[PDB]
Amino acid sequence: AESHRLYVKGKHLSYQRSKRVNNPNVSLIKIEGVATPQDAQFYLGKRIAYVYRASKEVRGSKIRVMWGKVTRTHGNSGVVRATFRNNLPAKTFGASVRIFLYPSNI
Template identity: 70%
Template sequence: MHTFWYFRKEAKDIFDNSTTTHEFISIAQEIHSRCLQKLVTASMSRIRSDTNIHRGRHLSYQRGKRNTNPGTSLIKIEGVDDTKAANFYLGKKVAFVYRAQREVRGSKIRVIWGKVTRPHGNSGVVRAQFRRNLPPKSFGASVRVMLYPSSI
């Protein structure tokens, strides 16, 4: 939308200063291509370079009516809305990245790794088991779902 406004503004300036219609058309086409190029480069800069990562949310532990099972976490992956799509992620690595207070080996950033074990229900939620159980503080927190190991 903003690109079109920019194009109109530049075209108006050229129209006021151009002598022939042919000259106006050729200059307007050049401006239009420049505007499209700006739009494409702006949208490309917003695309993540690491496309082998999908985002997800830690919903809860697997649970029944009364008992929770902290060994298995429920993960909702963005854009996954059914069991068929969730089956693609079986076996994929999941990383819960968090920041700790104390520095260890030169970094305060820590990771708990896990993997997707099976779908949970019909709405695209998956179950994942982590090397160490995720803390309850992570409910609602973001996790990274890696697209490896790949079976394609």
């Protein structure tokens, strides 16, 4: 009734970067309740969606979606590397990103 949620919700942290150079292709995603790389291994290859309202109505909906994939883990915290088709806008550093359960290993 309340929950229609078939996705794990995680925040979009940053781009893959050094101190002075950032690659905007690979985005870093924190996922909720994920503490280690070992827990993150489950989420590898799962499809991601960044869902947001837009001003103009495109296809009978004021809402647009950018799709992408988890590629690999990033450090010991369960932060995860993620490549989308069109890269995420960088305005979205700290915005909710929906990580789905397809394709399933389980």
